């Protein structure tokens, strides 16, 4: 019963959340290699900054 | 029948995809809790220099 009423209550607010999450997730998903290279270069630069 | 059709559409071939999702989620959350202290330090001390 709890699951039934939870789904009945949260259903109208789910489509917009799914759409927004999908779009924002794809924003990084379509640039995976760029993001990973950015993280590696940022690791090098931030290590240089922190050590000094 | 409708629920089974929707579940098949949503969970067609996402076996490895959802496996990677859950594994990445747990790894990121664990490492974030491990490094929460640097995160707190950044959050609390970045404001002074930037506002300066």
């Amino acid at each position: 019963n709890v699951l039934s009423e939870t789904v009945d209550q949260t259903s109208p607010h789910l489509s917009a959340a799914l759409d927004g999450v999908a779009r924002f997730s794809e924003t990084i998903g379509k640039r995976d290699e760029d993001v990973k290279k950015l993280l590696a270069s940022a690791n090098k630069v931030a290590t240089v900054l922190g050590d000094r | 029948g409708t629920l089974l059709d929707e579940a098949a559409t949503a969970f067609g071939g996402l076996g490895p995809s959802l496996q990677r999702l859950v594994d990445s989620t747990q790894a990121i959350a664990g490492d974030f809790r491990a490094n929460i202290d640097p995160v707190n330090d950044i959050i609390e001390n970045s404001g002074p220099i930037i506002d300066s």
């Binding site: 709890v2 699951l3 009423e5 939870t6 209550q9 949260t10 607010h13 789910l14 917009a16 959340a17 759409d19 927004g20 999450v21 779009r23 924002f24 924003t27 990084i28 640039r31 | -």
Partner: protein, 98 residues
């Protein structure tokens, strides 16, 4: 099945095509099916009955009651706020890429 004792019989269905099958021809395996095979039916219940262990069922039930009781408004707020924030973030897709 003719009965539950072990008697069988062969059933023929006409189909739709009007092309008469010449005498002596053989119906292929592509349109023939076996009987119940009661042993397979009984053995298929083994995982279903093994998945009904009372400990796991009760633990999951109590945990779901604890987690999702009166949390409809909280989950609605989570969904609305994350929808708005993610839509605003995705409106800057080109900016994020640049």
């Amino acid at each position: 099945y003719q009965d539950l004792i072990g008697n069988r019989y062969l059933e023929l269905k006409r189909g739709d095509s009007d092309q008469i099958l010449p005498p002596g021809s053989t119906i292929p395996v592509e349109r023939t099916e076996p009987a119940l095979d009661l042993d397979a039916l009984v053995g298929g219940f083994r995982p279903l009955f093994r998945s009904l262990e009372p400990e796991k069922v009760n633990t999951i039930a109590t945990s779901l009651i604890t987690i999702f009781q009166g949390q409809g408004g909280t989950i609605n707020d989570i969904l609305d706020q994350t929808a708005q924030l993610t839509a605003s973030l995705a409106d800057r897709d080109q900016a994020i890429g640049e």
